[PDB]
Amino acid sequence: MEKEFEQIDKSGSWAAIYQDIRHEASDFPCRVAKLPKNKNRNRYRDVSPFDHSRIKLHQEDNDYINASLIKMEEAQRSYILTQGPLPNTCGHFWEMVWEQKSRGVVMLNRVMEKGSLKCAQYWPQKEEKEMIFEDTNLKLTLISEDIKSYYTVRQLELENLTTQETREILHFHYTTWPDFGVPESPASFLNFLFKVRESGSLSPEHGPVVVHCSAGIGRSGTFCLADTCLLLMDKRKDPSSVDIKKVLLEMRKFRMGLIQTADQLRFSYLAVIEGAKFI
Template sequence: MDSVVADIDERNGWDRLFREIKLTTAGYDLSYKTARLPENRTRNRYRDVSPFDHSRVKLIEGENDYINASLIEVPDANRKYILAQGPLNHTAGHFWQTVWEQNSAAVIMLNRIIEKGTIKCSQYFPLDEDPMQFTDVGLTVSITRQQVNPNYTVRYLNLQKDDTGEIKAIYQFHYTAWPDFGVPESPAAFLDFLNCVKDSGVLEPNVGPPVIHCSAGIGRSGTFALVDSCLVFIERDIPFDVKETLLEMRKYRMGLIQTAQQLRFSYLAIAEGARAMRDPGGQESTESSTESEPESPYESSDDEEHNDTGNGDGDVEKEPEDQVDQDKNRKRPAENDFEKHGDEKRGKQEDIESPTDNHIRNTTNVAQVEELQRVEEANNNAANLRKRNISERKEALSNHVNDIKKKMQESEKGNTYSSWLPYIVGGTVLLTVCTVTFYAFYR
């Protein structure tokens, strides 16, 4: 794998390889008619990212079975993934309904709520002890505790069926250091996150497929699924080709991996993971203490998402459905105190299924939430001040330009009058002389 990456780097061939993948998948004859039905259009975050009819996940309960999510199958790796768009305000209930009905043990979130001032995902999970109720689907989500790492946060959630009281323990693995339309800072940091997910057992076939999402559910989500599948091939000594694996995965959901940069990162992460398997002791652990400060999901990332669709080359156009005010009832995440759990193994399944963990509450949460809210308010005030300053500068510039135009017009008028002044004076003198001459002659 290292030699493959080096060869493509030497030839500057990543753009060409990515174009080849796009051209090949553009020829796939796969329909997505259900996603384009009038009653389903408002359930799509992006007009050009639609699940194929043959692989779309269907809601079991309710009159409408549509959700923008696809089931990706990699039989040789014995892997299944549900790749979904980031929930909209009015589809967050459908998102949790999918988790419940598909018996998923985990949600893998690869984006922040707001990136570069744009809403990328609804706030579909609780950040404090107050549960979130989704009455349209009869589900309630509550958080029991969370572990914060430098690049990601692990939240332990309870998903409850309101009519029966049944509760399912769900992991949420939230990678907070992956820039939109970009790649993580290093393969090692990403592999640390992937290993955390794998160690929990949520990717194994004895549970339902994990629900993986970013904003559109194709770029970062596709990268995660591709790297994980290829590492399984290496672990089981199964021959594979990264390009062909991605082409097969794109038959289940359009546009997986959106840029040549993401494609190169996938190769690098696979190569790094392979080296770690050959020499487990040679890799330094990138894990950090859970006492570190939480990384906020509201901070901006470095770029915008979406420049590729699976069945064409057109840019993805945003839908306006999720532009409603999401600040109401939103609170910043609080860092729980896990010193008393310091000897627990991260990702251990029985940790979240223990009844004693279901009601863990930390009294420091309130103060931390308030502090984070004050920081967010200060950031908002600073942003508003910058907007006002920019607006004032634009207005001043506009007034200055108008003044210049006015002076130029006045100058042009003055120049016109000056150019005609000698003729006016000469004509007046001539008329006067003629008048005097005629007067003297006839007299």
């Protein structure tokens, strides 16, 4: 992978490789996402979940949420990629976390970036000021918060108000992805991924991890692509047979737009290369 990276870098063909992936990426219908009754549940008109892989809310009237299940068969890893919650979809977001039995939520953006709101403040900021989502009958409480230099980890408690059952959720918040471009080094991003792994949030004893940024495709795609490639390098008899382009195209069968720029594609290669040297 490193020799391939050096060749693409020296030939200046990141844009060409990226455009070939965009050209060959799967094109599946998103009929449910485009229904008029779901207009207020979507953040960007160009980012919708495919019907075949969308997560359904266990709701009789409207089961729609902009979220997709990415199921990586060989790696035995699943992820739910979703948009950053909207002011009216926070209850739906936490209903999905509850119903899917997720242990972790991975957030790759700040609430405000470039002076604009990228997602609703969907979790409580103080222990004593819990949030109640009346539409989905859930209460959410901040249990603890550990602020580090490149990321913050929070323990949240989700309570189903109907039964009074509770579930503990870990919120992994990468707070240092630059407003423009990608990080210069993948070191902090890889340390973040390893901290998510260590928590058990990506493990098969739990529901799939819920990952989002604003659209849930750019930085979200880089997170899952790096994690899956590293797992395959550890599992395979020939780790050099792991082709990041092929893994990305496989992921793109489940949600559109994963990796939004040639810069993110180059960053994903860099994170996999540096991650493999570490592992």
